[PDB]
Design an enzyme around this catalytic site. Structure first.
Site, PDB file in Angstrom:
ATOM      1  N   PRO A 109      48.072  13.840 -19.441  1.00  0.00           N
ATOM      2  CA  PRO A 109      47.675  12.224 -18.922  1.00  0.00           C
ATOM      3  C   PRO A 109      45.862  12.883 -19.570  1.00  0.00           C
ATOM      4  O   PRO A 109      45.409  13.647 -19.104  1.00  0.00           O
ATOM      5  CB  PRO A 109      47.605  11.314 -17.871  1.00  0.00           C
ATOM      6  CG  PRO A 109      48.524  12.660 -17.715  1.00  0.00           C
ATOM      7  CD  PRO A 109      48.705  13.761 -18.318  1.00  0.00           C
ATOM      8  N   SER A 111      42.112  12.032 -18.862  1.00  0.00           N
ATOM      9  CA  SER A 111      40.921  11.827 -18.152  1.00  0.00           C
ATOM     10  C   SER A 111      41.159  11.213 -16.319  1.00  0.00           C
ATOM     11  O   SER A 111      39.992  10.139 -16.104  1.00  0.00           O
ATOM     12  CB  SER A 111      39.763  10.563 -18.493  1.00  0.00           C
ATOM     13  OG  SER A 111      38.377  10.348 -17.731  1.00  0.00           O
ATOM     14  N   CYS A 112      42.117  11.757 -15.929  1.00  0.00           N
ATOM     15  CA  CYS A 112      42.374  11.280 -14.892  1.00  0.00           C
ATOM     16  C   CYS A 112      42.664  12.383 -13.758  1.00  0.00           C
ATOM     17  O   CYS A 112      43.041  13.041 -12.915  1.00  0.00           O
ATOM     18  CB  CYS A 112      43.649  10.230 -14.376  1.00  0.00           C
ATOM     19  SG  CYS A 112      45.069  11.133 -14.577  1.00  0.00           S
ATOM     20  N   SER A 116      42.740  17.350 -19.102  1.00  0.00           N
ATOM     21  CA  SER A 116      43.561  17.669 -20.420  1.00  0.00           C
ATOM     22  C   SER A 116      43.035  18.393 -21.793  1.00  0.00           C
ATOM     23  O   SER A 116      43.630  18.830 -22.341  1.00  0.00           O
ATOM     24  CB  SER A 116      43.477  16.122 -20.554  1.00  0.00           C
ATOM     25  OG  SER A 116      44.246  15.689 -21.854  1.00  0.00           O
ATOM     26  N   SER A 117      41.603  18.653 -22.006  1.00  0.00           N
ATOM     27  CA  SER A 117      40.762  19.188 -22.892  1.00  0.00           C
ATOM     28  C   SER A 117      40.723  20.776 -22.559  1.00  0.00           C
ATOM     29  O   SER A 117      40.664  21.021 -23.533  1.00  0.00           O
ATOM     30  CB  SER A 117      39.471  18.612 -22.761  1.00  0.00           C
ATOM     31  OG  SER A 117      39.559  17.305 -23.267  1.00  0.00           O
ATOM     32  N   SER A 119      43.212  22.247 -21.941  1.00  0.00           N
ATOM     33  CA  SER A 119      44.235  23.131 -21.930  1.00  0.00           C
ATOM     34  C   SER A 119      44.547  22.877 -23.422  1.00  0.00           C
ATOM     35  O   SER A 119      45.023  23.867 -23.926  1.00  0.00           O
ATOM     36  CB  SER A 119      44.899  21.359 -21.647  1.00  0.00           C
ATOM     37  OG  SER A 119      47.521  22.958 -22.034  1.00  0.00           O
ATOM     38  N   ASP A 160      39.132  24.103 -14.126  1.00  0.00           N
ATOM     39  CA  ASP A 160      39.861  23.420 -15.130  1.00  0.00           C
ATOM     40  C   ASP A 160      40.688  24.801 -16.540  1.00  0.00           C
ATOM     41  O   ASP A 160      41.643  25.145 -16.170  1.00  0.00           O
ATOM     42  CB  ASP A 160      39.752  22.970 -16.370  1.00  0.00           C
ATOM     43  CG  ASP A 160      39.097  21.170 -15.750  1.00  0.00           C
ATOM     44  OD1 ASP A 160      39.485  21.232 -14.580  1.00  0.00           O
ATOM     45  OD2 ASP A 160      39.177  19.831 -16.135  1.00  0.00           O
TER      46      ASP A 160
END
Length: 317
Positions: A109, A111-112, A116-117, A119, A160
């Site tokens: 998903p 922006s929560c 996500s980026s 990855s 991240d």
């Protein structure tokens, strides 16, 4: 698999504890998870890089002579991947002599707080290095990820990119990390989580961080959250870990970075799971729930009546 192209599957990430505290030198504890992205890279011998965002049905074609010189923030949704490419290429000191196509799929998903980026970034760095049979160590990969985030955003944090890179569970403090193994990692391996995209985060992280900046009680509650981490690390059973998550949530509310929706999902997580809490910055986004096997079906049912998306996941590695 017969005739397979090069394909990289890379993890997502979740901050279990210390979301806003890390900004002030305290600890954060994040874990890699099952929600993954997939990056496929193959030749095309047409002399140009082709990017494909299958989940968006968008595509981009660039010549080989344009990559090192593109400004990533000019290409919207393709910026991280594109940046991962340019950075990996000059780090490896390679000037592409042949074209390639990259297909991207993500179950993560956006922006929560899941990364996500980062990855897409990690999978891209790996895809591009592997494609030139020049695999890098987790050392440089994590660093290239970081540098990609720092080039696209003004600054960056290793969280991240490093958690996704080294996987498992990590203790983050001052842009430095300590990997966590032994008994805690073991315990987590038996846990089942639920990622719940409760609502669209309608505010930037910088903004959320500002709002948190203006709290008189901030530092006092941060200590609490850290006091929680101390306890978590010594943890042994799901019931306590759960309560500790809830406790972190209540503390995050105290920084009014939460919302009625998140809080409502946490109540459900509390009653039918072992515990829960928002994760990451708090402009909404998603909640992490510790599943209580014995009541999982009830949990899923109660969540189903809510206007949300639910994802099953476990620590990766």
């Amino acid at each position: 698999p017969r005739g397979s192209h090069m394909i990289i599957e890379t993890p997502s990430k979740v901050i279990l504890f210390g979301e806003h505290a890390v900004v002030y030198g305290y600890r954060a504890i994040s874990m890699a998870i099952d929600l993954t992205s997939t990056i496929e890279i193959k030749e095309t011998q047409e002399d140009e890089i082709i990017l494909n965002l299958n989940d968006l049905n968008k595509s981009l074609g660039l010549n080989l002579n344009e990559i090192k010189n593109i400004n990533p923030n000019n290409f919207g949704d393709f910026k991280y991947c594109l940046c991962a490419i340019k950075n990996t290429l000059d780090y490896l000191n390679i000037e592409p002599k042949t074209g390639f196509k990259i297909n991207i799929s993500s179950k993560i998903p956006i922006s929560c707080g899941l990364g996500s980026s980062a990855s897409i970034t990690i999978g891209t760095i790996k895809a591009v290095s592997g494609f030139y049979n020049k695999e890098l160590k987790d050392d440089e990969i994590a660093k290239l990820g970081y540098m990609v985030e720092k080039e696209i955003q003004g600054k960056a944090s290793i969280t991240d990119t490093s958690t996704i890179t080294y996987k498992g569970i990590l203790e983050i403090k001052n842009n430095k990390f300590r990997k966590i193994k032994g008994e805690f990692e073991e315990f987590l391996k038996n846990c089942k989580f639920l990622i719940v995209y409760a609502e669209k985060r309608k505010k930037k992280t910088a903004e959320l961080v500002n709002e948190v900046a203006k709290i008189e009680n901030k530092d006092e509650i941060f200590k609490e959250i850290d006091k929680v981490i101390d306890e978590a690390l010594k943890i042994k059973n799901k019931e306590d870990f759960g309560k500790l998550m809830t406790k972190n949530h209540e503390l995050l509310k105290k920084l009014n970075i939460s919302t009625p929706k998140l809080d409502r999902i946490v109540d459900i997580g509390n009653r039918f799971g072992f515990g829960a809490k928002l994760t990451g910055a708090g402009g909404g986004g998603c909640v992490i729930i510790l599943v209580n096997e014995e009541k999982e079906k009830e949990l899923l049912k109660e969540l189903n009546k809510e206007d949300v998306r639910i994802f099953n996941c476990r620590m990766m590695n």
